[PDB]
From a paper:
Tripartite ATP-independent periplasmic (TRAP) transporters are a large family of SBP-dependent secondary-active transporters that are found exclusively in prokaryotes to catalyze the uptake of a variety of substrates, primarily organic anions, across the cytoplasmic membrane. A defining feature of TRAP transporters is the obligate utilization of an SBP, which is either found in the periplasm or attached to the outer leaflet of the cytoplasmic membrane, where it binds and delivers the substrate to the membrane component. Here, we have characterized VcGluP, a TAXI TRAP SBP from V. cholerae, the first experimentally validated glutamate transporter identified in this pathogen. We have shown that VcGluP preferentially binds glutamate and can also bind glutamine with a micromolar affinity.
To investigate the selectivity determinants of VcGluP, we solved the structure of VcGluP in the presence of excess (0.5 mM) L-glutamate to 1.7 Å, using molecular replacement. The refined model obtained in the presence of 0.5 mM L-glutamate contains residues 29–328, which equates to all of the 299 residues of mature VcGluP. VcGluP is composed of 2 α/β domains connected by a hinge composed of antiparallel β-sheets (residues 116–131 and 255–267). Comparison with other SBP structures reveals that VcGluP belongs to Cluster F. In addition, each domain contains a disulfide bond; Cys53–Cys67 in domain 1 which connects a1 with B2, and Cys191–Cys216 in domain 2 that connects a8 and a9, although density for this disulfide is missing likely through radiation damage. We also identified three Na+ ions bound to the surface of the protein (purple spheres and Fig. S2), although due to their distance from the binding site, we predict that these are functionally irrelevant interactions and merely a consequence of the 2.4 M sodium malonate used during crystallization. During refinement, we identified non-protein density in the cleft between the two domains, which we assigned to L-glutamate, which was present at 0.5 mM during crystallization. As expected, in the presence of ligand, VcGluP adopts a closed conformation wherein the two domains completely envelope the ligand binding site. Analysis of the ligand binding site reveals that L-glutamate is coordinated by VcGluP via a hydrogen bonding network composed of direct mainchain and sidechain interactions, and indirectly through coordinated water molecules. The α-carboxyl group of the bound L-glutamate makes sidechain and mainchain interactions with S75, mainchain interactions with G156 and hydrogen bonds to a water molecule, which is itself coordinated by the D157 sidechain. However, we found that binding affinity was only severely diminished when Y45 and Q93 were mutated to alanine, reducing the affinity by 213- and 990-fold, respectively, suggesting that these residues are the key binding determinants for VcGluP.
Numbering used by the authors: 29 to 328
The structure:
């Protein structure tokens, strides 16, 4: 854990986490001559890899879905074999990430229940995509054999596979707009498919980090009505092992430059400082973040 160099783990290069890490690092790096922190971004497999690799020491921060923030801390669900990681700390939360289904026009897939018996990219092993897909799979009584093909491509390979007719649909736990879904919809005629019904309703009712989501009509070519699903929040997490001064300066960089931050990616346009402190954060805030929030009056 260096005091003067930090690495943020994100996701595939055509998702939202990757440019989010870039935006955070830009706001840290602009004052590196003062606080001495150089911030670097890594593209990664996603939430699960990010938690595990903060733990093993190679990442200082990671962008992690609110459900895997909770389970990574507690050593539950996807993290059960790894055991608890009670040093994990929240920093702030960010944009909403719906459970998106992106299907071929000819796929016959009109809702989440239609994924069974199709070629479905359920997600790569390090991703929040695959881990939250397992939750959906649980709700339906599905296993990997419920699909004709349970493909595990990382995010930046999914649109090509869908358009090349190697899968009927891919799922993606991701904010909007993003490049992967823009490509599939605007260059290969894919559709965004809702996830509704009693199984999704149970998922939302039974968990505080799953809430109903809506993608508006016009977000993407060809999706001409709004699309309902459920969603999580993207969150920035770290470890107690990272120094309070480092987390303080990173948190201050984002919040004291909030009007700039919310101009850096269209997914950030409607963030609210107060919600960023609490929403989607179910584990202790890092003391360095708390220190800034108390200075700013966001925590009394
Ligand atoms: N939530 C996805 C990443 C989404 C993104 O890259 O923006 C994951 O944890 O795998
Ligand atoms: Na899992
Ligand atoms: Na809920
Ligand atoms: Na603004
Ligand atoms: Na507004
Ligand atoms: Na909270």
């Amino acid at each position: 854990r260096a005091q003067d160099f930090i690495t943020i783990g994100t996701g595939s290069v055509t998702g939202v986490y990757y440019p989010t890490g870039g935006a955070i690092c830009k706001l840290v790096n602009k004052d590196r001559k003062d606080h001495n922190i150089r911030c670097s971004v890594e593209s990664t497999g996603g939430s699960i890899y990010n938690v595990n690799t903060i733990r093993s020491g190679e990442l200082d921060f990671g962008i992690v879905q609110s459900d895997w923030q909770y389970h990574g801390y507690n050593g539950t669900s996807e993290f059960a074999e790894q055991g608890p990681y009670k040093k994990l700390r929240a920093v702030f939360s960010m944009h909403t990430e719906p459970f998106n289904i992106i299907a071929r026009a000819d796929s016959g897939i009109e809702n989440v229940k239609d994924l069974a018996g199709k070629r479905v990219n359920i997600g790569n092993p390090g991703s929040g995509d695959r881990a939250t897909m397992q939750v959906v799979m649980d709700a339906f009584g599905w296993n990997n054999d419920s699909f004709k093909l349970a493909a595990e491509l990382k995010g930046s390979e999914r649109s090509q596979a869908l358009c090349d007719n190697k899968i009927d649909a891919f799922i993606y736990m991701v904010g909007h707009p993003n490049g992967a879904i823009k490509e599939a919809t605007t260059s290969c005629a894919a559709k965004l498919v809702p996830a509704t019904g009693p199984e999704i309703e149970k998922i939302v009712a039974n968990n505080p980090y799953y809430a109903y989501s809506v993608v508006p009509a016009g977000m993407y070519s060809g999706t001409d009505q709004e699309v309902k699903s459920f969603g999580v929040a993207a969150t920035l997490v770290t470890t107690e092992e990272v120094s309070e001064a480092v987390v303080y300066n990173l948190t201050k960089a984002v919040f004291e430059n909030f009007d700039t931050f919310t101009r850096l990616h269209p997914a950030f346009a409607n963030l609210k400082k107060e919600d960023m402190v609490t929403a989607g954060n179910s584990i202790p805030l890092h003391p360095g973040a708390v220190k800034y929030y108390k200075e700013a009056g966001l925590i009394k």
